[PDB]
Amino acid sequence: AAVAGLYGLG
Amino acid sequence: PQHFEPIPHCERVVINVSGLRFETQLRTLNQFPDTLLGDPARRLRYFDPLRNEYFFDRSRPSFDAILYYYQSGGRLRRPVNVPLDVFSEEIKFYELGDQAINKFREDELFEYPESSQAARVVAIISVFVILLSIVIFCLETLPPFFLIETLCIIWFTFELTVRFDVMNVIDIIAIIPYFITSLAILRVIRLVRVFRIFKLSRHSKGLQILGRTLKASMRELGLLIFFLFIGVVLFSSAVYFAEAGSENSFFKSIPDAFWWAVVTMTTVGYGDMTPVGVWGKIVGSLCAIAGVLTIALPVPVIVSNFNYFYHRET
Amino acid sequence: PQHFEPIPHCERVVINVSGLRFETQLRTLNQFPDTLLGDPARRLRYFDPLRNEYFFDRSRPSFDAILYYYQSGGRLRRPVNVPLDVFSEEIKFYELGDQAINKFREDELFEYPESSQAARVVAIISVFVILLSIVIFCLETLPPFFLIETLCIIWFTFELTVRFDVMNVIDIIAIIPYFITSLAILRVIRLVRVFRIFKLSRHSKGLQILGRTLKASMRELGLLIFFLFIGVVLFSSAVYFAEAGSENSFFKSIPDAFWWAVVTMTTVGYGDMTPVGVWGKIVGSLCAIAGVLTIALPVPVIVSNFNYFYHRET
Amino acid sequence: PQHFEPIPHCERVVINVSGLRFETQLRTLNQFPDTLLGDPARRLRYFDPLRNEYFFDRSRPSFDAILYYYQSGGRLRRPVNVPLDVFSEEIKFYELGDQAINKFREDELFEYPESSQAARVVAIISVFVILLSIVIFCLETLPPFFLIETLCIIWFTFELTVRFDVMNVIDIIAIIPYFITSLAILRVIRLVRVFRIFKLSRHSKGLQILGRTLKASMRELGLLIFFLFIGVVLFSSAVYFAEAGSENSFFKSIPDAFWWAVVTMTTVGYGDMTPVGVWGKIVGSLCAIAGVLTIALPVPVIVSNFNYFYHRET
Amino acid sequence: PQHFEPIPHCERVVINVSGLRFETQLRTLNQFPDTLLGDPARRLRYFDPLRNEYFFDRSRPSFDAILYYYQSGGRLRRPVNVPLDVFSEEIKFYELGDQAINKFREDELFEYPESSQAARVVAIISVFVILLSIVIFCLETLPPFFLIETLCIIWFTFELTVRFDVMNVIDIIAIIPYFITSLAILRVIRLVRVFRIFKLSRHSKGLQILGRTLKASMRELGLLIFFLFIGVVLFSSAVYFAEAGSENSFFKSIPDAFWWAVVTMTTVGYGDMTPVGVWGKIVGSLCAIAGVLTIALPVPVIVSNFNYFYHRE
Amino acid sequence: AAVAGLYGLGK
Ligand SMILES: [K+]
Ligand SMILES: [K+]
């Protein structure tokens, strides 16, 4: 989904 | 978000991970105190006095990120070559620090509420009471029920009291119409009486996931509403000005065409469509296409958020 | 879900995989008896006596998990760097354990049903008879057929007896109405007579895939039904209470508005909509938007499951 | 699907690719004759007589698959760590063989049609003529045209003769109704006259992409049609048997309800829906839900194929 | 799009990146001047005089891409094993040159518009004025307003002259009908007066993202329109010729069936459908299926573009 | 109106 975990958590 | 990195010119040491040799400056290891590699007290056990090397019979692919933590001076991230469990097992062994481990994880009576002590019955009883209250409400709106409603409200008040947060707000809302009991005030309180259906959020997990998704995508919901507002205004104005040139006008005004524009954008369907002329039909076709596009645009983000929350929960 | 790892202090050995050197002491290999590396008997052939070094002329990127399987003491997790075929042969070559291989599989007369020995004609006849029975059913519902139905039923019974599971249940069901033959019971049996269409699951592969997907998505289906139920109840209540202030009420009661709520949530379209006032129209727009969102939320999980099952089958 | 791998007991050599040392025996090299490494003639240049090493100043991560060709004896998959261009040059350098490159590639006058020689004017004229023919048709069906139709057919047959494959089949079909010209036969030929619109496949690229996707998605198209057929039959039977218990029968027979089932499953909308009772409304709600699910099931295969073809073309 | 690779026969040097040894020709290093490795002056400090090697205490997994730039002689691309920030730091560490890093970035008064200096109040006032103008327009179309419309136009033109792309074009358009003020011309100007709703593009970021997505998906929009046109024509012809065999013909002509074809393709719903016979119903079912398919086809490209732009912004 | 919001993955 997100390559670098963009906008992960909050 | 900013970190410090070692600078070169003393003594260079070699670290062996199951045959993979790593050469690092002692200054790089000394940046982070404590830890296995940070201090020599807990490195003598793994140090080889013969070959002058430190041996760690572990997984070789995971040592690059662990070493890079010293190299980056604070930046720790799991490379996409290994599962989460294998990376997790590594960090405790090297003991990167409680502040480092938990921060990395972020990157990844009163018996009633709990579902145990064989009191699950209480939860089942509450769910049955909620369903019964919904059924009695719907049947009361049909062309007695007051006693059952009183019993349901008594149970709701007792449950809220023994518990005594959005769930608490819903619980307190569920009884305000009953304790309260112009015609507009009566109409609105009878309407807000329906919020008893939201009391299922305590017991249902999918409802909680949906609520979390709605909370986490407020910007996306606002953008979707904004796009629908722009579309309905534009297309209602277009169709009204297209059909203003006829003696018998299907749409009396732009606000009258808001419903037609909304149902065409959403592809619900207005119904009868014959009296509208050719220009109105062209505007309606454009409105349908634009509605499909503008509703298919922002929904995927909410869908992905819901999927992520559901997978995290399960 | 717990595994053990060798701890440091005996003798260390070196493993060579196409030039890539691996260092590991004997206790890690001694953790797993048998296998190519666990016992010395099956590894002395690949040992080089002059260099005191084990040589393995194999692929270097796939050996990392092989060593980690010994390192992790049972946790054999595939690395995503290679195709499945190369990793399949690598584990067999080391004979890491017959029981060990099995868990990796899920980690990644009576001549009638088997479509061979020319039994393909017997199948074709079964499909033709099923289609003929469906056609005769639809035709007898139009404003003789009894003989054709009798032939279809006797063929079904003969097939069931020859074969003598959900398919078996469907086959038994397909003849129960005919063997049976208040008005309600007659209507029920006539309705359940349609279950003959499900007999195509034996021959159709896509129908089997759909059935497996439905079996594997029961939670998703339940969540979808729950969301639609909540939305329908809420919006029916909203529209009924919005229209309760008019002399000519389009909706007599909340249950009366259930059909309108369902068709608006599913975007099917109610049809005639003019008598509804402005508040009802606002509630309808909100219902349409919420229905689009609610339908869009849990579908791309059943969709993914169906795609996975279809690709696995094909 | 099967290949042979070298087995040990003679002579072994080392390959040094910019510091990444690879050690393989000559038997592995000798399995593939020719090539850069198969014969000593074309690999002696890179050989270093001083260190007895083969030096290859190329990219390290791409050599794993190159050695795997010798390792597996005919099996080649690209490792997922490098772009396609990097590996394409890498394999071409070692000249694995024309059959090898082709295998890897598959695993990942008459001046009229060729749009050059500033004949693009011919293509523009053809597109304009096709559009004019479509317009002439759509206005000749309204409540002279024959001359323009004759001119369009003359241009079509001239282009066909000059050019003289389903596209050629469409070109043949586009003139058959005109050259031909019971009432049913006349209606059929007038209908098949519309296939002039498909002549745009010659010029448009998106139309060709759609045609290729439809050809490559025949299985899921058939599956979608089968699912629609099953759902329509089931729900038509259910609604007919649920509603037939009243004096006023909205549906005369099961075939009568096929259109309603189709529009409900596809969410088009039947329209007026009042006379059907509560059981029919429940059946309709279930039909709408099941139709949404069944039409959402197979289409994320068709769309994926279309996206792949579109990206390949562009 | 063409690059040159070093060809052997003169000296070879070894690079030690945190234990990972690399062997590369000196001519490869000399292909790119300047930089850390291009000249001995900027790399002599990092050199190890006793081991005859260069010791780089940096991230070893990312050195392969750095070496490939010299190996390929002009090609730089990050492999998918490290975050982009790590690679961005590494290339700055070696200082490949701004002439090379520049093409890598895209590989993956006048105080009014700038929302700072306590000017956000001006933006709020502008948004309120735009909303008020839209409301007055919608209300005056109902069965005075002129003064409020004049005030809104005065504010719009004041902002335009104070500030004096496409947003400026929209701002100019928003006052053209007012400054102008056959029946067709009046209808056209009253219709184009609605363009005031597009002035919200200046303030709203999501609407700007939508505009960028529309600009970047013109080919897909055209393909969608073309597919809809083809399907509409085909199914209108089919249904008209199916229902032309009855005295009471529901559709008078193929153009009359265009609306029915559009609503069936888009699954909106024609409404009354009883008089059409069995052949027309079959044609309608086929039209509904084909509409669902042909609309679901080209959408998850506009969707992908919108998602990309939203994540970027 | 908007359930075909698919993506990649699936393998
Ligand atoms: K619809
Ligand atoms: K609809």
Numbering used by the authors:
A (entry chain J): 2 to 11
B (entry chain B), C (entry chain A), D (entry chain C): 83 to 91, 96 to 194, 216 to 250, 278 to 298, 310 to 326, 357 to 489
E (entry chain D): 83 to 91, 96 to 194, 216 to 250, 278 to 298, 310 to 326, 357 to 488
F (entry chain I): 2 to 12
The authors write:
Here we investigate the mechanism of fast inactivation in the Shaker Kv channel using cryo-electron microscopy, mass spectrometry and electrophysiology. We resolved structures of a fully inactivated state in which the non-polar end of the N terminus plugs the internal pore in an extended conformation. The N-terminal methionine is deleted, leaving an alanine that is acetylated and interacts with a pore-lining isoleucine residue where RNA editing regulates fast inactivation. Opening of the internal activation gate is required for fast inactivation because it enables the plug domain to block the pore and repositions gate residues to interact with and stabilize that domain.
To increase our chances of obtaining high-resolution structures of the N-type-inactivated state, we introduced two mutations (E12K and D13K) that enhance inactivation (EI Shaker) by dramatically increasing the association rate for binding of the N-terminal inactivation peptide to the channel. Analysis of this construct using mass spectrometry revealed cleavage of the N-terminal Met and acetylation of Ala2. We reconstituted purified AcA-EI Shaker into liposomes, injected those into oocytes and observed that the kinetics for the onset of inactivation were indeed faster than for the WT channel. We collected a dataset for AcA-EI Shaker, and using similar data processing workflows to that for GT Shaker, we were able to resolve three classes of particles where the density of the N terminus was observed within the internal pore or chamber. In class C resolved to 3.05 Å, we observed continuous density plugging the internal pore similarly to what we observed for class A in GT Shaker. Although the density corresponding to the N terminus inside the pore was weaker than that for the surrounding pore domain, leaving open the possibility that the density arises from an average of alternative conformations, the N terminus adopts an extended conformation. Lowering the density threshold of the map for class C suggests that the N-terminal density was an average of two conformations: one dominant and one weaker (especially the region of the terminus containing relatively featureless sidechains: AcA-AAVAG). To address this challenge, we modelled the N-terminal density by fitting the first residue and those with big sidechains (L7 and Y8) before fitting residues with short sidechains. We also observed extra density entering the chamber through the window formed by the linkers between the cytoplasmic T1 domain and the S1 transmembrane helices that we attribute to a second N terminus. Although mutations at Y8 destabilize the inactivated state20, their effects are modest, and in AcA-EI Shaker, the second N-terminal peptide in the chamber displaces Y8 so that it is no longer near N482, suggesting that any interaction between Y8 and N482 is weak.
